[PDB]
Amino acid sequence: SKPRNQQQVCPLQNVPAWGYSLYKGIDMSVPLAYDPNNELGDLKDVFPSAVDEMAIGYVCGNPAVKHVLTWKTTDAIQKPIANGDDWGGVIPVGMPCYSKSIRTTRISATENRETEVMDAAPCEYVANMFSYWRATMCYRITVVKTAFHTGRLEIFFEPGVIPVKPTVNNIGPDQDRLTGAVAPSDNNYKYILDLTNDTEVTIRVPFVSNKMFLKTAGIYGANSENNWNFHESFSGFLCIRPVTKLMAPDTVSDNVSIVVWKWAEDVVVVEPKPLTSGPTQVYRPPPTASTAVEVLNVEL
Amino acid sequence: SKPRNQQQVCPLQNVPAWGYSLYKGIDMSVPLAYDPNNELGDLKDVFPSA
Amino acid sequence: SKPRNQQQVCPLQNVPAWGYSLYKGIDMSVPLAYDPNNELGDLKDVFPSAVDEMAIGYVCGNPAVKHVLTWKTTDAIQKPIANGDDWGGVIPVGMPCYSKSIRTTRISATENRETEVMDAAPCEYVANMFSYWRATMCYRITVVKTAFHTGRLEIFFEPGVIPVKPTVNNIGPDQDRLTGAVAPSDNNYKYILDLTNDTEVTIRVPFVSNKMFLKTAGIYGANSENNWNFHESFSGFLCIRPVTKLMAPDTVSDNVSIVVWKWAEDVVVVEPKPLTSGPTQVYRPPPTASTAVEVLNVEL
Amino acid sequence: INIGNKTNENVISFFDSTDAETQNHNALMKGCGEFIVNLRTLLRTFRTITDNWILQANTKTPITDLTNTTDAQGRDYMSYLSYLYRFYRGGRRYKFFNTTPLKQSQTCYIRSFLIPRNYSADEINVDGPSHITYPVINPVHEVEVPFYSQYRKIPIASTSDKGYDSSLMYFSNTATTQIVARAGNDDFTFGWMIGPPQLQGESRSVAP
Amino acid sequence: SQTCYIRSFLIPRNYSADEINVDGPSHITYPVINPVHEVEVPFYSQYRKIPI
Amino acid sequence: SENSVETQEITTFHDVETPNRIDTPMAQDTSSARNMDDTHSIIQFLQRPVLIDNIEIIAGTTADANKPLSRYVLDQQNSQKYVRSWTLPSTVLRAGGKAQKLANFKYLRCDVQVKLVLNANPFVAGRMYLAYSPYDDKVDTARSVLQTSRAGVTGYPGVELDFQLDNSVEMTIPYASFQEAYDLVTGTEDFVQLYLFPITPVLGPKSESESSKVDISVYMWLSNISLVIPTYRINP
């Protein structure tokens, strides 16, 4: 009635929390509850939407304004809008960030701290988490005009290397190379919108550049020194330059506005780690300009 | 998708080589080979008797 | 509702990484990924071949030139080509290496370093990994002749011990024993090719020598001292010696070329460790002859 | 008989007792048991690439500080078949065997992370998919790097591009000397065959 | 004051210490956590049987 | 009246109405240039063989063109000696006026053909080997063709190049890069890098004033091409 043991010797390895960084597999976390079958309900009557609000098809499908342009009669034709934006007329196609503003405080009489502050579209904000991306971009360019402004406006794609200006702390585009008659727009994919009665256009740009995935570095640490990752992150740029000059009477104003929206469809990503040389630090606005921000460091 | 653990606590005794002096039972000796299914042939054509 | 434990006491042995040197069995390596079911695709559209490029039936089925012979009118008949090759006319049948070149540098005024450098056919290069071999060899002997060179050329097998010359650092074959009228070719398996219009021949030599597997030592450490492993590694030699002398007019040149190709079909091997007294060190060519090569040693 | 040349290819054979493929099964069934066919199967066995790797205490060390050295030698099966091929795809499983004279006045532990290839120490972050072991209770670090690449395949020792697939970062706390062994993962395979380079023999170094 | 460990390898029969390499099918145990070294040598021979 | 969106090759417009377009009364056919040749597409145009190189060998030989393949390569100074080096596809694209016909494109997916027309007298023998090695001047030093032994050189893919048996070879060098679809603007392509090695030295009568020539020529053209993205640049 008490026989001997017939089972073999079960081999062993002592690994507490084996593979904890995976979203699948039964985990040994002890619930501090009354019931082991602790089951919360479904998503009914809790969040007042019925849309599944966390899929990347919906999070990155959220439109955000990137640029607000001022297109003048002073500005020439066949040349993008150079406004001190500084990107403005040259919008880089691609999901991660491309712009930055620099906050300069003081520490001592001869030392300062230059903290890079980036804007974040919701397509951009997801891509900072992941390392390599692949996404079909979208842009909805809208002219804010009166009933009387007319003209013809051209938006053309260009694949590959974006013309730049490396500076000590930022990268600006180079409108010396996109003018003329030195860079024609006769072979690129283009769209010629009409300001007579047409207003909006959505320009879907699918993903084509010689690699399976680009990088999500973008503008982080992009300067005169380290600017390889900025080139290998976009597959080129849209460019908004006017074919025909703005025709406006003296009654209406000579300035119109071009609002560039942005999102990304069909988004797929690769690794759940940031490719940047720093953790995902969310910028908290200081109360007074004399105060600085705590910096996350890389020791363990 | 990552539920909690439902299995009981498996009891334990640390006995390396439990019952090694028996001709039956699966033994934990590691083969120093390429294949875990290391199978020599039968006794055909090796020893010149049958 | 909370009953007592009914399972027996599971026995235990603490062996981390039990049997790691086996290509089968589930291994406990933690993936550093997002998904436990991390599945790469199949081999479609990645490598631009459709041939399975790693099977030993294909890796060792890759033809390589071993010898380039110069057969002259000066050279006699019924005697192999002794050219300072030094093997040349006596090609040992067998999969591992048989030749070596010695690199002599300087260390001090009276000490040198003699590093053995071997050539590597792809049939030879696989066999250095494994210890014991068994393979059906192949050889494709091609005469590089003009339209006017004729003659009769004999290739005959011989099973067993190859005649040798042990030296201080290398083993050369012995053409004093393969000449005559002291070593006939009337009972061996042979082929008598004709240089009139026939050019090529492929001479498949299956595996026959009194053992289930030979050794893959070959020429490593083969000298006056340690030359047992060289004898127990080949099952003999082919021998290319001419029946009838080369007949060439004064217009065409008196030198023809005999190119000996080599591969091995139906290859089977035994152990995944090198039988040699050293690790598998791949020879890296130094930039300048005064520089030496780092040597792998045997401590742990 | 005329002045000219032909090709007339002849596969003529020597000894023809039995079919070759039949005797090879009978020869391995009495001498081996194991029947080695495909070299893809030898990229699954962990051969030890080093015997000693004295890592300085508290330093996030990339394995490329050892991989650039140990892909030259071809001691294992990954770097010995790095010469018969040109491209590769698939992740590299790593195992780390502790060989340290441990000290009781510390709590020794081991981390691991990801970097893309050929980056240096400080130019990468640390929050990523991790793994942790404690060498007092578990001397083996059982880690597999996946295949997270921009390109479908990778050539060996590429150009000035960098950070195009992922590899390992190895962080400890104490000066742990170890053994490192490796092989490719379940879907690691080479391709695009070329011919093989040379080999190196014995270096006894006689005086004259 | 030491970390004791045990290796194991293969040699063919009756060779001496230094005349063989070390990269082969291995096994490793740690006698602080596992006093038993559980090793099986296979039968990798040239001949079908061996006399004593 | 509202919907005027027309489509050219790669170009779209956006007007208020269809701008009252007039055209030909009847499109009658005219002069017969269509009846003299069919139109050659741009994928048809990058399949024309070009005369690249014209290699002459005399045996001889004082020069490097008949140094035979070394049995061993012991050091990088005494590297493997060859005839010519074609660094594909940067040779085949520049020659034959092809690069001035694939301007204003971006990405290319080609397969380079290589043919050797050969024409030598019957009184001369010898044999060569036409090996290609991808990334041959990008990989580490020991892995190139120029550093391995004679058995390692010949083990690379290629074809025999005997005189009296082969007056023409057909080798298909595949699309052998890791990058999808070769870049053209700011191009540093040089993926597969071809070679030509003599195995045996070229043999002829040792008395001179006889002129034992060889006279190899090389033809290359692309195949299975796909040329996709339009741009405004190009490298000169």
Author numbering:
A (entry chain C), C (entry chain C): 1 to 300
B (entry chain C): 1 to 50
D (entry chain A): 1 to 208
E (entry chain A): 105 to 156
F (entry chain B): 22 to 257
Tell me, in the authors' exact words, what the paper reports:
Israeli acute bee paralysis virus (IAPV) is a member of the Aparavirus genus of the family Dicistroviridae. Viruses of the family Dicistroviridae have nonenveloped icosahedral capsids protecting linear, single-stranded, positive-sense RNA genomes of 8,500 to 10,200 nucleotides. The major capsid proteins VP1 to VP3 of IAPV form the capsid shell with pseudo-T=3 icosahedral symmetry, whereas VP4 is a small protein attached to the inner surface of the capsid. Here we present a high-resolution cryo-EM analysis of IAPV virions induced to release their genomes in vitro.
Genome release from IAPV virions results in the formation of empty capsids that are the same size as native virions. The structure of the empty capsid could be built except for residues 1 to 21 and 258 to 318 of VP2. However, whole VP4 subunits and residues 1 to 21 of the N terminus of VP2 were not resolved for the empty capsids. Furthermore, the loss of the structure of the VP2 N terminus resulted in a reduction in intrapentamer interfaces, from 5,900 Å2 to 5,150 Å2. However, the loss of the structure of the VP2 N terminus and of VP4 resulted in changes of the distribution of charges inside the capsids. Cryo-EM reconstruction of the empty IAPV capsid shows a strong electron density located on 5-fold axes close to the inner surface of the capsid, whereas the volume is occupied by VP4 subunits in the virions. We therefore speculate that the extra density belongs to positively charged ions, such as Ca2+ or Mg2+.
